Design a protein around this ligand. Structure first.
Ligand code: CL
Ligand code: CL
Ligand code: CL
Lengths: 333, 338, 337, 334
């Protein structure tokens, strides 16, 4: 198995661990250690119980410096600084850094200096990492020397594959995006709105989505913008993409294109549906994106609107494991 | 004063009465009757207490067949058939039909046959009426002969003036809109089948897509948008403030700060009291009980390239609309003397 | 196999079908027909997709007048009139009436005249029925001649076992109870006015008082408590999972840790799988899809003086009760034969 | 006027300013300074917008080290320690410490050493203060020597006058209470209380409650005789308190109700209110009573076990009481 360590055991790190067992990736990957500055009993407790994701089905036990998931023993560490992480002794092939605080090149090099062979950050990080992977779009650009990698973000994983599809087919000239985030989620991007009363408002929030799009597709500088709101919902996100395109199109053609991708080159990554569903129906769906084809529109012939769903935690948590495996694989090429 | 009667005393009818008193339009308009199939004590109760609008500041009492707001006495009616409405006897100048159920020309004609000089429906209408008014945009098109009129909707009243401001300045070539509706006053959970399977699902938990015709409303008003406009919509569990997220391609090249200046000036000038503009860091409840049709949130404005403008527009989905009902009423009752 | 028909396929009827499959009770009970005044395709869709209970893990299909769960074919009926139901032709052992609309003795006799051998109601019904079963407490009172039975309600199933246990141990003198209900599907209004003015108010923003039948359920079940129990209740905007907050004065002096040990031992013994017990730091969602009738939250147990016991008890108000509908059905069809 | 300063401009400190102006107390009290470790432009924004009742109606501006409500200038400070508060130089009669974190006798003394004649804490604080006042119940007990005072808390101010009324009339043997809190309104971190991290918007969540300890400092006889639990639910603005007491006198519900109703018309006019209307929690939003008894929910089991449900705005009654108590403290100093 690929031996992995997780640095950080908040929502992302705990979901990565849940996704490892639930998805059967446990046949390819073993979590050997988890590092977090908190009580191990508290870690076992939050691993087991979750608002969004239900009770975890595997037996969870904790004793001394071990967390047990089924018969698997995972070492629990509490190290404040990266320099003293015992990654040589654990034989770590990839460290999945889920802290959301570490994310530079220097941080990745600290993990490597501590003995991890490779680092994968659960967010965009600084702009001098080795590679950013959006699984399904560019994982085949990974090289063995890409030792510090970003996995992008949930919302960029969600919409980049759709931007890619429509650009290749139709030629995007410009685009604009709105994300409707669930209110529970901790920090997609970085405020006098945050300190407000409970009013159950729709709350404008700062988005890094356009920066991530234009980092991925620098031919889209000066051509892409994004806004975002938080609403008091139950864990699924909607992304509302509007793009102008060179090639003339009708909605029915756009849906066909997206439906073929879902059933073909993007199977497991982009899904497509025309069922009368609501956001909660995508709760715990491992896809990066589910295109809601009842909502596709073309204004005239050149302004495409498409609405895409994602479980902002579960999709990204499974991508972290897909990317991990693609790194461990290229390492052995 | 213009003597008006309200048919229907749901949220829109109730808000219209509150807006009459809060706005100072009681100087020009008298509500002489309200018809609803409901207990009169319950009508008084709901007029007094509301989740979105708070306690009504006027004293509300109820006795016999009268509802009193302060010292005004309003007749309370409980007539099932439009033909039985005693509008001629009351001398009604305009009936504001706020039932959401009546909406055709023939419904308007029944109100007029019962003695109302003119009728204003609180939604776009069940068929084709004499006119549809977005106040601040085409009320100057009303003539005396327009007797059955629709006031459009909270949503079209909000976005149509913004589309006008942008189109007049920059030439809109195509557009697409998403409305984020508030689900506050719908059933929060539900145990019933409905032909639309989205409607059987708990509104309090999900972003839910809903059917929208906003795009046809829009194209009626802007024929030049050929078929160059589409729209979608979702309902979310939130308070009664709606967001409309409008994306249009324009001919003139433009920057975001220019668009915001255009809208900010239109709010001080020609759309004063109709369109407002803000640049503060606000959240949706900040617009609760605001009487404008549209509030442009300039912190949210974006231009992709020099031609694809995004604007986020807020409105209380009941309060601006209820105030627009009174404005249109007044414009109909005054052109009656041409 | 106990052959059963579901009358009504709203939330309770669909949850009863899901619980049949998820609990393994499919080894003793077969659903032969479901009757509902709604499209068969809509019935299939809603069995598959749910807000509180997520996606049904079984494959659901629908074709003509059949609904398929895995390889099981279930006949779909759309009858407005009870006496027109083909229960004789289908050989129905027990009808689970989950409409929430029927519930009188005469309604039960209508299902029987149509051919069902016995009827079980998914609510308290009239004061008229042959038996009201709180499974775990009085199913052994069932007899072959009980034909028309009520299963009580999710909240009476949840608090009656606890009340029994405290009464046997300490002797209850008086009691008062508050239900903190999650969003209530039967409190919805369509029109805009309702003779109950609380029902017109937006439910997401408020704690809303709501009429409760709980103390009447308690006194029906334990008549020695008439004029010694009262109940109030409120509605809060959570999607599922209800808290019952029970306060009782008792004769025997007692301490919180004793009351917890008693209730903890009951959960491990005579009430295993009916009443659970926890001292974990959990929130209401952690009980979602838990099949117990009751989970006592040991962290909230209080005794004031030596005589006034407060206990907070959770239940998934949908899932415990649906699992009990199947238990009581099985006990009904078994005492029979 | 009584010159007051506010220390800490979170929810309660902003409410105390709004309440000063809306209640007409501006007639007797002047807020002269506010201290907060936050930007002043931000403070003025939250004063204006964060109200639960529309935009605050007075004009709010901010410039230099000043915050203006209408024509009033209020000095703004950003001192990180009590020692260096310039109270003496401002002439402060009472500091309302609303930080929710200072609350011992030593903190009180530090405010007074800095110049405030008297201190009122907006929470129960230490058990070594000079007095705790539930206004409408024990303010006639304040004297000139009570300089460091707690005003108890919103819920405590809600249920204690009702506990007093029922005890005077029927003799409370023992009591149990449940508080149903609305949202104050999910930080992804670990806390020793593992409930803390859980999404508030989704659940009924048990919270650790200070209600019984507050009831039993106020009435020490109830000390092995009163308990409290509490949950938090995703609603807004208003809290419910569900009180159950065993009493010595036999009693009927309609009598309990008449008693509480008359108390609302008489000795507790303006403090406890009473209703039988079909109302919901949001109907008491911005209601300035410490308590509204919901008469429709009153019950008596077997003649000795009274249940009563009581509503309060989370903060608005309490903010108004901060001023009543402030006024009473500044009044017995002369
Ligand atoms: Cl649902
Ligand atoms: Cl309401
Ligand atoms: Cl959680």
């Amino acid at each position: 198995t690929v031996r992995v360590a997780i640095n950080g055991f908040g929502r992302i790190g705990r979901n990565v661990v849940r996704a490892l067992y639930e998805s059967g990736r446990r046949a390819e990957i073993t979590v050997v250690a988890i590092n977090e500055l908190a009580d191990a009993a508290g870690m076992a407790h939050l691993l087991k119980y979750d608002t969004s994701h239900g009770r975890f089905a595997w037996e969870v036990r904790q004793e001394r410096d071990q967390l047990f998931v089924g018969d698997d023993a995972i070492r629990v560490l509490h190290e404040r600084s990266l320099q003293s992480l015992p990654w040589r002794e654990l034989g770590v092939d990839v460290v999945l850094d889920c802290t959301g605080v570490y994310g530079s090149r220097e941080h990745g090099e600290a993990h490597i200096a501590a003995g991890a062979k490779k680092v994968l950050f659960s967010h965009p990080g600084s702009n001098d990492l080795d590679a950013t992977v959006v699984y399904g779009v560019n994982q085949d650009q990974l090289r063995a020397e890409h030792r510090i990698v970003s996995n992008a973000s949930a919302t960029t994983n969600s919409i980049i594959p759709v931007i890619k599809l429509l650009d290749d087919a139709y030629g995007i000239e410009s685009g604009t995006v709105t994300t409707i985030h669930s209110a529970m989620h901790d920090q997609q991007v970085i405020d006098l709105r945050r300190t407000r009363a409970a009013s159950q408002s729709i709350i404008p929030v700062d988005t890094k989505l356009a920066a991530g799009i234009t980092r991925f597709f620098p031919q889209f500088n000066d051509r892409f913008e994004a806004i975002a709101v938080r609403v008091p919902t139950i864990n699924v996100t909607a992304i509302d993409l509007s793009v102008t395109v060179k090639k003339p199109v009708k909605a029915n053609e756009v849906n066909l294109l997206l439906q073929k991708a879902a059933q073909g080159a993007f199977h497991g990554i982009v899904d497509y549906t025309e069922l009368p569903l609501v956001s909660v129906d995508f709760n715990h769906d491992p896809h990066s994106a589910i295109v809601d084809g009842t909502q596709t529109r073309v204004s005239g012939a050149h302004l495409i609107k498409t609405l895409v769903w994602c479980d902002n935690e579960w999709g990204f948590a499974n991508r972290m494991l897909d990317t991990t495996l693609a790194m461990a694989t290229v390492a052995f090429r």
